[PDB]
Amino acid sequence: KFTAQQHVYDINGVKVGGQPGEYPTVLIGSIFYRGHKIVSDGQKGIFDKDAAKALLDQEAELSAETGNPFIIDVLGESVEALTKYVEFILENTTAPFLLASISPDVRVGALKNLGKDPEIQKRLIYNSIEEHYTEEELAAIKEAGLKTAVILAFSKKALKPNARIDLLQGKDDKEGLIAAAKRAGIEQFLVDPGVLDVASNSWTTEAINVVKEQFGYPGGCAPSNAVYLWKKMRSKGTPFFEVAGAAVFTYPITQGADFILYGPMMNAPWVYRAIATTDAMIAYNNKLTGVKMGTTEHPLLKIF
Amino acid sequence: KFTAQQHVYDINGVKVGGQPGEYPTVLIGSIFYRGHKIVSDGQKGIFDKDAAKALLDQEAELSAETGNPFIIDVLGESVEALTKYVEFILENTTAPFLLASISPDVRVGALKNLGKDPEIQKRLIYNSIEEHYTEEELAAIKEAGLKTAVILAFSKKALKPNARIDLLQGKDDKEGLIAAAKRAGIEQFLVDPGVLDVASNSWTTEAINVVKEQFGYPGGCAPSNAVYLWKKMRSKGTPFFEVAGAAVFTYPITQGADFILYGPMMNAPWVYRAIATTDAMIAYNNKLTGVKMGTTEHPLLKIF
Ligand SMILES: CN1c2c(O)nc(N)nc2NC[C@@H]1CNc1ccc(C(=O)N[C@@H](CCC(=O)O)C(=O)O)cc1
């Protein structure tokens, strides 16, 4: 059990946060990522709408089967593409989604094209407020009226968990990412300490623990990149890559994390089955921790 | 982490116990279990020597690849069969092994045949001293001169983790399982709190924590019990069964367990890969906690 009173956010019906076993893990699948084969032009945002709709329908089905809620990670490499990707997600699912790009200019341009829309404000989560934030970026977020953002504490100047906490809460003459988010009008903070590599997923998890111990913000991480760069294990193929993947993705959940960005949506079939199993074992512990489940839509009540 | 100084046993080279991150997880694979297709006659102990050698060679290879040591779980349905099984294991591997059977009189009968052989004393671990131990069982163990035993610290009267203090130490007019084991000349106790089903693996792990926190005995369990009877998952095939299995088998390691009985040895290829991943992430946490690895033969230094 975590020391601080946990913030539980209601993201247009998706509950995220709380004490371990209170709410199922929220699973965040990536679509239109670099090299996604359903995209034929990543600059114009031209993609197979049937194949994309099939992924969204599969996520709904897996979600209904396990009780794990989903938020879609929507990636783009251009303003034009990311704008079209967001319009498509708005119309073809009811789920919340992350507005994501490596390029902050792409994120901000796309956000500008969406204007002030009550549906966007309810469903769109900014991915992310990170070390390179600008006043322009914070202004674009405020003008869009967004209320939830991923706070990403990934930084090669902040390897140790406590240095990632310094990046979040601020230190000396740096306000920190939480303060920057608040100045943008963000009231709800999904804290992602970053995953440098597989082995340091324990440090990511230690940083999630400190966040939930002291602040009570929902904590999660995105270990898909580190897993896919693990040449030695990937070389082995199926099912060796998936079980190792499952070990990495479940580990933060075993230490009380609230959400996982699991990588490409095509991996949802095995990710949902691994994560739902962990959630069901943790919830069964609820009597010993003195926690009450916040919902009957829970893997413990569904997967057996 | 644990307050108690942890007992670390050396079982013919296999180190079992310690603080989390100090030693790799010991992996215990089952052979000659009920339904094992390499057995044609479970009463006479007629089995495929080439297929048994191949499993033991595959355990040695995976062990050398990850740094996870192994103990063999040797199951028999008759005295004649279990005797032959143990003679084969003695000759075809160097690993310690569990002498195991659903039928206590099969364990007792087999022990009589194997005699007070100094190799039996060094490599044979009694599986197990249970709630309903008999004087004839304790006499057989003493006469064989065994030094290590699994203490199955399980009872439907002691479902709560804290009740395992009662089972181990005794209570009221009941001799504890530790006192019983010592009367049989046992000096080294591998504590298994028992696993009823998948979900209750969280209660098993809380019991392991209590045992290590207060007594320092190595703690492990057999999640295999629940997983292969989980038809919903098994019938889905690869990789759904493997990732679900990986979630269950890794969970106790993430809470500080020292050994896992992972079921049939045919599953070693994906069990080693999942468990090595968890061990590597836990040991990486040593860099923050100051906990020193007790061996360079560790997944953290091998799998990347
Ligand atoms: C019950 N159990 C156990 C335990 O709980 N605690 C200790 N110390 N030792 C043991 N030893 C035996 C057992 C762990 N080993 C196992 C557990 C389960 C299986 C198993 O599920 N076999 C399958 C058939 C094999 C298959 O097709 O999977 C079955 O349905 O019976 C095979 C071996």
Author numbering:
A (entry chain B), B (entry chain A): 3 to 306
Text taken from the publication that reported this structure:
During energy production in Desulfitobacterium hafniense, MtgA catalyzes the methyl transfer from methylcobalamin (Cbl‐CH3) to THF in the catabolism of glycine betaine (GB). The active‐site cavity is located inside the hydrophilic core of each barrel.
X‐ray structure analysis of mutant MtgA in complex with THF‐CH3 gave further insights into the reaction trajectory.
